[model samples]
Target: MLKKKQLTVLDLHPGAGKTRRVLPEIVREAIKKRLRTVILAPTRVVAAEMEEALRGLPVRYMTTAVNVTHSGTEIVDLMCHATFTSRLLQPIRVPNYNLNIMDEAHFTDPSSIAARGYISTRVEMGEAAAIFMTATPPGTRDAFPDSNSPIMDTEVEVPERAWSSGFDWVTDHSGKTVWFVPSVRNGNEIAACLTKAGKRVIQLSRKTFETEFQKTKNQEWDFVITTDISEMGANFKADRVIDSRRCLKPVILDGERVILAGPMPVTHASAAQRRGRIGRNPNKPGDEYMYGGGCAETDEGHAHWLEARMLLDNIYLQDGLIASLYRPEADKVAAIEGEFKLRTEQRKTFVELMKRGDLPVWLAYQVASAGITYTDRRWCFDGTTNNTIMEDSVPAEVWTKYGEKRVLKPRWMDARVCSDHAALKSFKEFAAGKR
Candidate 1:
């Protein structure tokens, strides 16, 4: 029932207000079909904003519809939409058909745990279609003949030159003090300079970022330079996002200037989302500046300035890691299942672990220590750190008899023999034979 003519791509400029305008029409179309639609935003705050915008539209005339921000809202709004009401409450509930709307379509990498969950949840139930809203889609048009199947492109007032305009704005701002920061090696030097200049300078590091991130989330700071995790999931009115690459962080700003100061360049997905920040701001241009200290050795610097551009222009196929990671989560799961010999149920469990509220912090640390050995025998004896807890209140030993060692240590315990078949008398005999 999709209006093929209406479904179009708007190759507009970055920071253009096209998203705000197109969303309502898209919502109306979904409602016309009585489709169970879920808008998956890059951040939770963005999702809330999308919900607010849709609710304001005079869509009550629709026979069945609901807009949910979070789980609480999903539960509360269930009554309004039969598709939502039936499945969310019942133990074995199922939706006949559904559609997923991705705000920042660029972040849809199946490798990403969040993306995996988004795809799995919909496919587990019976769902029909997916709608991706972003300036860029994965892979060049020529690379995949069937790439345009699920997406509908739109055209708007903002033209192709709009992106260049945004880049120009960023270049102009980069010369200003507000849009520049020191590299990691010279961070302390810049911190000292800022301190002496009478500007209130707050230095953040891996050692104290957790405490600082919490404090800054509640209280305003003159300036804060910290890790990407600090910005993820939380909303902040920052002048810029400096020296970091966690693009999905929810940044709520009124004309906030985002400075990409670091050794790296912005990912295609991050670049798209960053530009979207300014679409609603009336006063200041939501400018994104990329600053490098002439250090091309860093992968980010080369990627942003040269590599991504080259790839986009068809000079060469970009590395999957360097190019924007925006594949469907279900596709990633299927790929992994075939490549890794992992069960679909086990893949589901891994994704569920990722979605757990407490896993982000720990996962952040694990990601940081990319070179660490995962199969260390010592980990079994040392017990795993219960990373979810900031304090030692709930020790790892308390949950698992092996304590912290159970987590960090490596061991091969056959899943089938792990106490599940205790009721079967023959189970122990089979387990012994395998050993």
Candidate 2:
């Protein structure tokens, strides 16, 4: 139906059977038109799953390997359908297909260099009818071709349930149960506890989750603890979903001096996706349980679920969209740029010192991107840290022949050089322009 009208974006909700019901028709239409088709999955697991789903179809299809040399064998015939992870598709140039289906299209950020490169390469080859399918659309509007691009949003009548208390709910419930935790470390820790309690537990990590999921897709287990890996696209039927109440926190880089915005918690979008996974069986209704320490625990420890509930309420009740609660203001951008400039200058000085030695000028330039400065106190060799050569240990006279009069010690060694350290003395000072 999309090919007939040349639709571009299709925002789909899970539990709507879009893959089984709608995808086949699109593929068949593409084949009848003699146009080669390609499906791009966000992860290797999704790519493998797509390859498996299209197996029974009467079309020639292959999933490209991580290496292009290995992928050459699969894409030799232009008419054969190809499924590729977005990472593999980054540098590989392919003949323009008649149809390009991007599964989980929201994963591609238009602002990212890779996404821009992929789109530019494809458009350069030729115009193709594109279908971008995802339950959660990209947070930014620029991720799509244009704001007015046609979007086919599917509305599915999902079963509802209120958030309740803890593991007792799961223990009391029958059939398959899935526990969504924040991190692999947390999941493993919980899984170990569950195992100790004699529960049949499976902990899924990035490395082995997909394969393990394939075998147990239709089977029932006591408890399955997973991270965000199983949050989207993977379909698992369970009688109950236990949310371990994980939220994303700000990441402090460069030893808590430089801050970067980390991933967000289970957004309204992902919460719905997780909820949809359970109670899919016609005979069963799903129940969601949030692990909120106790009824009276209302401080920071319990803020994860509290914030999540508020965000979800906002999404469903009023805006029906996720809103950006925090972003660096314009003034803050200027401050960040100032910080970057200061760091870059320090890096240049460090590179200059290295150049005074016997290091090649070209090599000195190559290490600039590594971000090691004269005052870093630790050396990084071949991307490994703690590979330091202490300034105090190295003799100043060693490089005298190479035009060194005195050792270029770290900036922290002298009060006179303290001017350069002003920007980073405190994050509060840096943010408030006190520096």
Candidate 3:
């Protein structure tokens, strides 16, 4: 029955064993059919949790394309989204996987469709089935891809709460606690504060995640402070949770309002994912709290639904279109379709402009082609941020001329509204001292 459906959205809250209980069957079935399966995780940290949970399954952990190429005999291959996409994008490479299991599906890019682009390509090349699983399901029908294929949708009964504000100020809470910070900087500040206050703190982030993850596993830490990297699907069986994050920012275009997938935006779905990290133990329902600006009970403007639609369109290049039979709202669906058309055209021109530039064409192709490449390690590595390229991409001579410490601004504008003309005009005005 699972294999009969071409696509399925698994909506189980965090710690609900969405994959833990379900994957063993999927793995065994795929192996029985002699099919290759790849589970796509948004980050290495998420993949780490997945690896631990799926220890009984015959799985190969792949962090690099070199390892992916060595994929042999293992029934299931677990790799982060970046590695999967790189293997897909490699000019000299070819794909062998027959099944695609994309975990934390909502984290895929909302701007450029590169990640989905590769998956869609593989599916077109005869991939059998797909599972787009996430705790934070899309709020509207538009979120699903235009892939008109019938879907098997399943939602776990587990629920995440919405606080008018975060949890109360009660000595933080007892037992192992996980504090989810907004950024690496925030993680550092809180780590310092906790350390000074005499807590054995470990920060889970790019530079520190590997070593700190080990310390937690050894049960040598009191608190784990992490950035958004762990907020998606990473697991820490903490007795409590404290999240320093805010609700999603609404973006209005042509009088139509939708939530923007910002650098650190926290939706109810995402907040739920964070909170679910607690309650990992079945005996006692854990205490999870969002101790920050908090969340709005209801403000999902079909943006969630648009994500799925965008994925399907990107996967099929919006040509082999099957308008979803389930449009959350007719009016909203029309607006979303128009929006995709506009953004796709705008992106085409943006890439063209990049081709005429002095920097490598791949720079423009990469930063603008994908929706949220920042989630992948290879896309956003140490010291990299949103809408910008690394200084490493530029020549040494150019870096010296621009000041050695200068950060490159390839996109130089917000993802919602990207235009070289507007960016260049703003640059000229700022340079000419025009406030």
Candidate 4:
């Protein structure tokens, strides 16, 4: 029932309107071929935006149906389609749908369980066509090009496009020298300056999540100073963005001018995401500035610069472990395993688990020799248990013995066994004097 496949590669210059233009074009073409289409995006917000943009277009013109994996309504409606619903509700009936548009195609790593499951289930049903679309492809190519479903078209490479006025378009447009402050006092000073300049000084922070920033009276802020949470999940048109400290990760500006001030290291995911501040949507184009060389850099120096840069580059282009797993290659199961190994090493809990799994004998001996200390009072649930610790859950003396000088709140029990069903059972039985 599917028509012959055709892959069209257009030279998309980076600027405002490129993504918007290309997205609709691809959808229209696919619809003209009478294909049942599914579009994927990195975030639910982006997906919703795409759906809203396409809603007014005529659906009957092409078999182009649009739905998002995240939208509750769209997800439920998609499930009811003959293909998905029949598979879930009626196994005997084979519902056939055609064409999948993986928007950020590079996020197909097996480590992302959701991504892996989506691709695997579709292929298992012998779906007629699968198209992987992404500006950046995964690093490990060998693991992809799944057997029996090889990529039919040549890999498309588009050139990077730049807009006029470069990265300073926001500053130029706003006609203001945006300032970034690292300290609260400095932020206050900047706010004062903006106020004197006859501009509203808006102090946006993490607290602004529930309500609009108090300073914004119908879209106005001469100075916005707040925590990093403000950097994400919120959109603002600023003349410039200033960070007092280096961001832990990148923040999307949605095409606003930004000036980051902090000690420079080689690179970080945050560093890269910060670059995305300028020229986010193709419809809006701008630039970003990262200013380094602070006194802090003189003392601490840059140890993680190279590693962070490597991480940044790998993530940026959709390559290496992160990209490979993010845009999983259907053919390689090992790809998932490899990526997990790299990511798990970064987390303390995961590292502990890995160590325990690898060297159980040493870990057991260490735990047995030094009994775990309970720091969290939540670990102690029973009032009776508090009696043993002098009516407090945590004994200050015990913590002091461990070289932790802080006064401790006494909990009724230890943290290790609090959530362990087996440990709780064992402790109760063991507490009966080994009877």
- lDDT leader: 3
lDDT winner between 2 and 4, please give it. Answer: 2
The C-alpha lDDT values of all candidates are 0.32, 0.41, 0.49, 0.33
Clashes of 1: 14
lDDT, candidate 3, 198-310, per-residue tens: 67888776445656677777866778877655655666766666665443333434432222444344655556666666656656653445345444433344343354343
Give me the runs in candidate 4 sitting further than 4 Å from their true place: 1-18, 41-48, 58-98, 102-217, 224-236, 243-245, 249-273, 279-288, 293-324, 327-435
Best by TM-score: 3
What is the per-residue lDDT of model 4 for residues 241-277, given as tens digits with 9 covering 90 to 100?
Answer: 4433332211112211111223233122222222223
Colliding pairs, model 2: none
Task: Tell me the TM-score of each prediction against the true structure.
Answer: 0.44, 0.53, 0.59, 0.38
Q: What is the model-wide C-alpha lDDT for candidate 3?
A: 0.49
